[PDB]
Amino acid sequence: NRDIAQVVTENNKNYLVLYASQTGTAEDYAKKFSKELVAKFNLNVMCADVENYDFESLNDVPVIVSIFISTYGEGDFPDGAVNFEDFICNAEAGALSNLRYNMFGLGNSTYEFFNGAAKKAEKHLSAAGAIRLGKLGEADDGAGTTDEDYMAWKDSILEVLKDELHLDEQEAKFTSQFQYTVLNEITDSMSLGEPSAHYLPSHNRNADGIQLGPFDLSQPYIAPIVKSRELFSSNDRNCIHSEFDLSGSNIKYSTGDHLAVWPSNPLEKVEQFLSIFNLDPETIFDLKPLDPTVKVPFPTPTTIGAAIKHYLEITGPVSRQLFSSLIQFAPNADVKEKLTLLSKDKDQFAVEITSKYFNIADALKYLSDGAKWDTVPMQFLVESVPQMTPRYYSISSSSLSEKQTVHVTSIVENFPNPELPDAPPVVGVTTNLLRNIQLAQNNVNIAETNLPVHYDLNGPRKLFANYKLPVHVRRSNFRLPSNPSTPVIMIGPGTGVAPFRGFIRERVAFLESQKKGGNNVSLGKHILFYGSRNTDDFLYQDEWPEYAKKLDGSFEMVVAHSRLPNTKKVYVQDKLKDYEDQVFEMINNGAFIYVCGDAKGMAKGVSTALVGILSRGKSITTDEATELIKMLKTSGRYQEDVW
Ligand SMILES: Cc1cc2nc3c(=O)[nH]c(=O)nc-3n(C[C@H](O)[C@H](O)[C@H](O)COP(=O)(O)OP(=O)(O)OC[C@H]3O[C@@H](n4cnc5c(N)ncnc54)[C@H](O)[C@@H]3O)c2cc1C
Ligand SMILES: Cc1cc2nc3c(=O)[nH]c(=O)nc-3n(C[C@H](O)[C@H](O)[C@H](O)COP(=O)(O)O)c2cc1C
């Protein structure tokens, strides 16, 4: 049932691929690899989520295993794949003696513990007596080489497995794990885009009561945005403040948690995709698993349009592996040839597709000069194109003062193609989707706005009506000290200020209560290092002076602006060296350090910064201080909510 060694044997699998992914990236490649392992060897491969099974019987596995794991927290395994982490990190000496495995670890060198998950996992496996086969792969999203790094590790391991297994090669060739059987009569027992398959007509009374049941990746709660405003005084850039209403359900979130927003690709894009392949969005269809191991991607049956709009991540960078897997369905002989050369030349792919920021469709239109690919099966796509993942946003509202509502401040990703000037702006999906709503919620003449794409605000069967979207809440560790007296140091550049908006709202709804009688019992010094380009992207500028008051002399916000006219750039990490002594004191007083935001280089920087502050302050070596910081990160006094 949920037993590994048992599942593999009963199904006669001769190769087990395991993935421990959080945002589908590892699941994505784990699949590219597993599929290509049947593409050249036709091995019956079981590509499973290291989260659905139980690994007690791991050692009893009779095949060789591929592990695709990503890194989180501080060398942490993706959540809901902790069992695996425990087991592995626990199995004693020679406890996996029979295991033959090879591994690929996705990570981002801009965080400490680069590829820590997989580094650790292979440290234990070793000690557990298992035998690693090829070299240990490290994808580095930091430098944006993930894909090209996978390609490399891939080639290698493919060679190695060829030997170990004495496998004969063959020409590549796609094999569906399902049974694609077109249909005719759209039933209500099927899906038109409903996220989870519980939101099916044949399944809750539209006008019902307080929705229950655990809501999450498997079952998201359709919630309504009850408020939305723009946050930037800018002309180009824009950032949306959204207020979802979760009262209709029993979702109790904490301050510091995250919100997972399930999108639906742009309309201009879903179209560009259906076109190049010459697909009929209406084509109803269904997917039958060819065995208890293959799990159905999404709710089925369904129409092709719904799957391209609600199920398939069509937008985004193109994997060079997807080109190599297309030769089979080339449109014409001249294509099949270029598709090949490209699928083989690291550089040429960059040059002709990657550096130009094409999307699957954009890319293939390019190669064929508009020549349609009526040869690509849908089954192919449903297994060859990544599933759409919800995007996580730091919760900007306080649970204490906004228990029922969830705030989400999300900067819109939407920049000009740096290569093809005449080309459409590189847009993110969930961000603009929120904007289209925000714009439409307020009654703005979108036609006059600079919006880049347009979304089906109605949804499945007007399931998204009243500006709703699928959502759930991820419980995090990002928490404000227990003792309302402990000191607090917050560092959140731009977007990353969100967790501190909560922190303050929260620390205010509190001091408020204590004032309403209970006798306000002190309140530690809270410092917030914010930072943005200028005064047009200054998040919630208007709000801080208000909080500053209710907080007494306990609050203090230091600001830093980078893009400020005639002024030397300045980051929040700079203001730290500026305010070092005060910082150093707050720390010596037990303060808590919170670093949130997008750490392109903000994690290491801010870290290096606090190490500078400490080394200097304690008058010790730079390595010593560094250690000191690591000890805090380990204790929990230095928390990071960076992406
Ligand atoms: C724990 C966590 C917390 C977060 N908290 C916040 C928060 O509080 N606020 C916030 O604003 N964000 C936050 N994020 C980031 C957020 O989840 C998304 O990354 C962001 O909203 C981008 O969403 P999207 O839907 O536009 O992305 P996507 O559509 O996945 O796009 C990502 C980027 O790729 C570009 N792109 C699209 N297609 C291509 C292509 N073919 N080739 C190359 N580039 C392409 C886009 O234009 C965009 O810049 C957080 C992330 C995590 C993991
Ligand atoms: C919140 C967050 C924390 C991360 N922490 C680390 C880290 O400590 N070390 C590392 O090498 N990569 C880290 N990464 C990067 C991921 O390993 C990398 O982007 C990978 O592609 C994620 O794959 P997944 O989406 O399949 O999990 C982090 C990413 C996020 C979003």
UniProtKB/Swiss-Prot annotation:
Every FAD-binding FR-type domain range: 218-481
Source superkingdom: Eukaryota
Subcellular location: Endoplasmic reticulum membrane; Mitochondrion outer membrane; Cell membrane
Gene Ontology CC terms, in alphabetical order: cytosol; endoplasmic reticulum membrane; mitochondrial outer membrane; mitochondrion; plasma membrane
CDD domains: CYPOR (cd06204)
EC category name: oxidoreductase
Residue ranges that the UniProt entry lists as topological domain Cytoplasmic: 1-643
Catalytic activity reported: 2 oxidized [cytochrome P450] + NADPH = 2 reduced [cytochrome P450] + NADP(+) + H(+)
Domain Flavodoxin-like span(s) in chain numbering: 15-158
Name of this protein: NADPH--cytochrome P450 reductase
